[PDB]
Amino acid sequence: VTGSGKKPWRQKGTGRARSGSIKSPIWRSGGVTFAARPQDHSQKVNKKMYRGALKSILSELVRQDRLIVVEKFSVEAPKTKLLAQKLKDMALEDVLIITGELDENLFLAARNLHKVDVRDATGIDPVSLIAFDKVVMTADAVKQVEEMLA
Amino acid sequence: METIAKHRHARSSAQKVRLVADLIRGKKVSQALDILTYTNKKAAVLVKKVLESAIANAEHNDGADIDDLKVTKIFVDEGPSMKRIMPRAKGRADRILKRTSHITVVVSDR
């Protein structure tokens, strides 16, 4: 805190409770006692623990039937109308797409929908896998996810 | 019908104007004018101005009659106080509260 190290008054005689600095945390407009510093909040996760968590997520997804597998999944033009009509035909609303090959066409198609997300198999993550209700696969994505989880 | 006259930030002390108000509370209007004319206080002068403001206020805006008007409710609340500095002996200073008040009268016929 901006201030001085001058004692506010003499130690004895004045009748006030003693003080030594204008910046003391008891004082108004004084410093904080245990003021926070910029810190890292990330945690170490073991690789086996992360992989086992992913296996548990996908296993319970298969168990409760929030996992839909299609052999092919693409659009001809980057039109969100075409994409939304196709998911309306499929009757799906809040969806996590994962695809084997990063297709810029359908990626730019799905960029604007906040209930529909699209990902590659190397980019999948537990919080989205749990958050999105219906999650769909391509067959190639299933193969590479299976091999990378071993 | 109730008619209300207030003097806000009245430059006087709440205790003194309460003494005068307690003198004139509950009396009939012309009598209260006699007490306020013949009571020797600046507080009495101030509340006399407020009371005639109330009487003419009721006369103009409600049309009630002066003979049956009666001061039914008088009360003073403390207004904000102006703070000053009074220098004393040996460097010390005191704070003077130049106290104000809010004077209120309610006149009615019934």
Binding site: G13, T14 | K90, G91
Partner: peptide, 16 residues
Amino acid sequence: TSKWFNIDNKIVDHRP
């Protein structure tokens, strides 16, 4: 500052 009858000596040090 401080009061003179506290800064003083004859009456402050009354019981030495």
